[PDB]
Amino acid sequence: MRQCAIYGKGGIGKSTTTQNLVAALAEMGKKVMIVGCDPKADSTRLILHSKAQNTIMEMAAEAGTVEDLELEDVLKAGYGGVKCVESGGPEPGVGCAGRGVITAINFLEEEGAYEDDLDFVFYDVLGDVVCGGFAMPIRENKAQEIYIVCSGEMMAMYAANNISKGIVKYANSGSVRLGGLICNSRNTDREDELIIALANKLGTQMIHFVPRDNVVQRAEIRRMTVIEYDPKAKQADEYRALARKVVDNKLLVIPNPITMDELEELLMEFGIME
Amino acid sequence: SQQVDKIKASYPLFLDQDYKDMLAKKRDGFEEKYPQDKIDEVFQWTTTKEYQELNFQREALTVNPAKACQPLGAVLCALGFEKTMPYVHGSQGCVAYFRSYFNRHFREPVSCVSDSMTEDAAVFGGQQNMKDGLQNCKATYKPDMIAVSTTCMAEVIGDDLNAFINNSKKEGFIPDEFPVPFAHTPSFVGSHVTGWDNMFEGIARYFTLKSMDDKVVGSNKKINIVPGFETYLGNFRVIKRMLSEMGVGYSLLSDPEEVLDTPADGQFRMYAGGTTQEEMKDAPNALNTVLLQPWHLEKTKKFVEGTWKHEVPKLNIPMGLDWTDEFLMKVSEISGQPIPASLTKERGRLVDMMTDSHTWLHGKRFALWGDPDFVMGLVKFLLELGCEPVHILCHNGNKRWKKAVDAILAASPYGKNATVYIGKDLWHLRSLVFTDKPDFMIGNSYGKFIQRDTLHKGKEFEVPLIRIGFPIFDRHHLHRSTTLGYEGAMQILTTLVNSILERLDEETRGMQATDYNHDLVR
Amino acid sequence: MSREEVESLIQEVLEVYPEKARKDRNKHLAVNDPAVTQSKKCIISNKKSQPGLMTIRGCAYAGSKGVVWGPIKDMIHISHGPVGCGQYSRAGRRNYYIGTTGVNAFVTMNFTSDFQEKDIVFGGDKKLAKLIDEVETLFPLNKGISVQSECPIGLIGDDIESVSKVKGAELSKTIVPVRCEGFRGVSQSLGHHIANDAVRDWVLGKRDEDTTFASTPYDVAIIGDYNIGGDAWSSRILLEEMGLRCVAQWSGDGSISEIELTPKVKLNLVHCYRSMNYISRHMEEKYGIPWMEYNFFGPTKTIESLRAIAAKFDESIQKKCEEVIAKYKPEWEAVVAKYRPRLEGKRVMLYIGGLRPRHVIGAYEDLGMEVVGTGYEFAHNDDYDRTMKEMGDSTLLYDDVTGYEFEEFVKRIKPDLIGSGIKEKFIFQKMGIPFREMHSWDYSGPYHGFDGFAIFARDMDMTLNNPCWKKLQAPWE
Amino acid sequence: ATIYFSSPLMPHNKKVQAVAGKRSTLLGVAQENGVKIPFECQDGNCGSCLVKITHLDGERIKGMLLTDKERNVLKSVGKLPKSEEERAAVRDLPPTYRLACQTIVTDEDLLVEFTGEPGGA
């Protein structure tokens, strides 16, 4: 029944790595929940096999109000084990862009979609800015475990720092804890031990280092996960290993926010920036 | 205290001594009531003529109005169609009040629906309310057409009807072929009759505007009859009978008698009879079109003259002898059908009635009020009977109607002491009948209080009320009476002469005082 | 009985509605379970009516002017706006009173501002001021003026508060501006609340200095009794026979002086909790005046309320209450003995506005009838919690029932008597089912106390066992 | 009706008299009086006009209708506790949070607070 959340900079493979983690978790007899708070409703593309899942708020507005919304109309199980829900987001410049998460999660508890068959519930939240609905899962203690997606790019580290500050601010409110760091790999030198060092100074552990592989694009054309596409692919075994360390991860610590200058010092000492 | 054998209604239970004592104690203790002599003095002051002068100086206060808002007439006109529902795009209170009013008057079920908007539509419009109301009404009550009227608030907010209806029909809410005529019915303009006219014109424009290519006047050899705002089923019945006895093809339009009167046999019919849609679609093929009530049918007059190319005759409402004869003349000249002998016999019966009752009808003074054409018909009939109409009030009469009634009064020597009022209310009538006492008033139930006031001044100053018009609440099934035509003149004469004789009998009943005139034969 | 049949009935009734209307209406029909204390898990109340469903609810103007402010006799009420609103509400409600019309009482007369197109375009403040002046000149005797706003007043944005204050200061008269636009609220409940708030914010505050009144340890104020057909007078004589002193009556035969003197009352007896709970709560909070609910419908409820009422005073009041009970026992015993055998075992469904469905079950049950279905147009959840206990198991409960709905339930249930308003009396009378107007007592009454209980039993025997009900079908059909 | 507009963005709270019951809402009285509250929609769904309403005169509290759209938007921002919802549904009492474009001006003195941010932090 543990609740987890992917936090991180956009475009760092949050949706793809999350979805492959779901595909890995599905096969060993686990029923798992997936919801993405990303304003673009691409967090459930690979599992559901739909062109674009109709998000909660679109069909809530078309149906007049969220009261006239049915759970079955949004709770779609593309695969047998896993169901898929999309929170959605408003039009740009129309109110706060995170209230879709508010409505989605509130409706989810209202209809009790968290009952008697959940092993993991996993959210994909935009971590570029933590505010309003994006900062909400930290706030009401809905997501016990948070995992941060990062790369060697400096904005990924800064976003991870902002996540650390956010969880530190709301540590006393509940059991919201950082379960570890997962880092996707771009074709750049000296990356894995970097994120290992960020975890070391953060007081947290490094979960797994997922590389850049060709099979991912083929899966994108296919619109099925790598494990569903190519279970013998080395990347599929990599995702399976990542999933088994998520399940077998035990330590959940209160992070330590890191200033700008020390981050910059690590960045120059590794030479990622001059 | 209540005896089981003589169970007593509130009157006269509250006349018991203990109840009188408790009421006296309450009044003397906590009501702070003004002294009784002061109350009588103020009553006498209100009776006087200077109070009449103060009353006639009114421009911002209306006391006891004698008119209703347009959507009432809109609903009455809409109810005249077959398998049709009135839909008032406004607040539910309007529809509730219309339904209660018509239930009280006709004592028959009345169907009407609304979208029942709230602050939400007050700030953001009621297009969604239109959509849900239309689709819910169609899915639930299964009508063949929905006639859309509007309340005051929908007109103030500037809510347009055509655009919302088109959007509803476009977004799949209702079938695109479903007839949904509409009309703007602001409540701050005119009265209920104007609302009836607006609804009728809206329906006629919806049905007979886009298909005028193949319409030829006089093709079907038929006459169109528009009755207007009518609350007398007997008027519809006499119109139908008189036209049927004359062998003329007739097309009554917006006729509600079948739905306003249904037999009780164990089942309830929401829909009953009415003018079919084909009849309205075939209306322009008629030879002509007559209007029963011209003075509140001006917009539809313009429509029928400028679109259906019908030479509408200059006919007055068929009340009395002369105007009924003129109506028969016009119908005969249009249709080419001679007047049957039965109509002549009925007219001769009318002349016999007037000869028989002239000895009592002459010289009597009447103050009457109601709708403009009803009022003018009653005035004409009274003038043909040797009566003397003294106070004529029409709350919803314009200057041209006043000029016409002045002209008709100047045509008879019995209209010398007659004065016509427009824009006045029933308080002005109370002042007029107090200062210049007539013999009777002719009006709806709302005047019954005025009589009460007169009874306080004295029996010699009390003037009785005869109930003719709309609405009538304290009498049962009087809506069944007939007013137009020879039969209607018959009924009006009978009622008037019987009321006169009843008043005389009541006055001359004092024992050893006034019973010397209590004649057996009158 | 046959609870399963009831919910299958409501399922088979709700199918015709579209998905939105069906889903919304499914929350407003229920099967009564007397063990339920919080009705919020069984029935949903106080919601907007679905558009185009032939609803029965009124407007806030009806709930304020036609219900609360109207019965007061010594004040003049002005319908600010078009002509229809007051005209359809003129003397349509039988709030009885004592006085002279047009001189010192103005209940059954219509005062309206007579709005026209220019009034809408430019405004009605100056017209309202001139109207107030003309009211003062034509009617010197009246003690005060109330101005009931209608839909156009709120929609065009006139300042009736400012003109009320200015004219009241100028003429030294109490002017109560009340904002009861029909679109405000979903039913008459908001009209009741608005009238209560206006009463609180003007009349109650008008005099706080006065103490010239001589009080007594036995001052009781009637709250929420509108003297419909004389109900409040029967309740008042029953109270005074018990030894108390009734100072204020709200609002049937109600006077502005009684309204102002009400805060000097030892105990408040609220009859209609819904219409006047707000003022009772405000009084209890400010003046510390205890208030409680009493029922005067039927002998059993009357006796229970009288005993509970006497329980709040010394033993002399209790002795007088016992004396009154003993005095009035034989009358209602004889009424019951005469009418119960003709009335035993009959089933009745009810549909009235607020607190009347729950108030009169006792009178029905005393005569041997049982209630199989009931509901409200605008009652909130608290009234439902109050009324769930008073109804038997497996009975029907409905809120804001529609014409099609109510017709289908009456067709399936087939009761012997139905009590509801004028808007359903003739749609049900053509189905061969006896019907009683539960709002105006069908131009009869009163129904309160033992004297009104006699009227109630007589009228119900009269309507139910009538020969006309046996001749609806032709002999050759 | 007196309104007192207060915000960290405004150096001084602004007092101004308003007409109660106007069809224009508190959004209008905010626009005519040079007070800026973020507005981002014309259908009352964005919720960017969320404001804190305080009635200083507790005795003079006016009943009002909490429409379903305002209710649902208050749920969408999250500024609607269960108890406040039940109170508004039963006693017809206003909640502490409102939407500037959907709140009607009532004849009393009111204090309106905002942070200059859209509803939902």
Ligand SMILES: Nc1ncnc2c1ncn2[C@@H]1O[C@H](COP(=O)(O)OP(=O)(O)O)[C@@H](O)[C@H]1O
């Ligand atoms: N293990 C991987 N190997 C190769 N490419 C990857 C891998 N993980 C993510 N990507 C790429 O990163 C991009 C980010 O995808 P997605 O997760 O949908 O967006 P976001 O990261 O903003 O949620 C994808 O286009 C995908 O091709």
Ligand code: ICS
């Ligand atoms: S005030 Fe209300 S509709 Fe409580 S508006 Fe209505 S004279 Fe009814 S059920 Mo007419 S909430 Fe009174 C009522 Fe009940 S007018 Fe009378 S009978 S006990």
Ligand code: CLF
């Ligand atoms: S909901 Fe209530 S009763 Fe209705 S209008 Fe509105 S305040 Fe009044 Fe009177 S005037 Fe006629 S009937 Fe209406 S349409 Fe304009």
Ligand code: SF4
């Ligand atoms: S809180 Fe965050 S998501 Fe909401 S409006 Fe502000 S910046 Fe945008």
Ligand code: FES
């Ligand atoms: S302006 Fe968007 S909800 Fe008010």
Ligand SMILES: [Fe+3]
């Ligand atoms: Fe009938």
Ligand SMILES: [Mg+2]
């Ligand atoms: Mg993504």
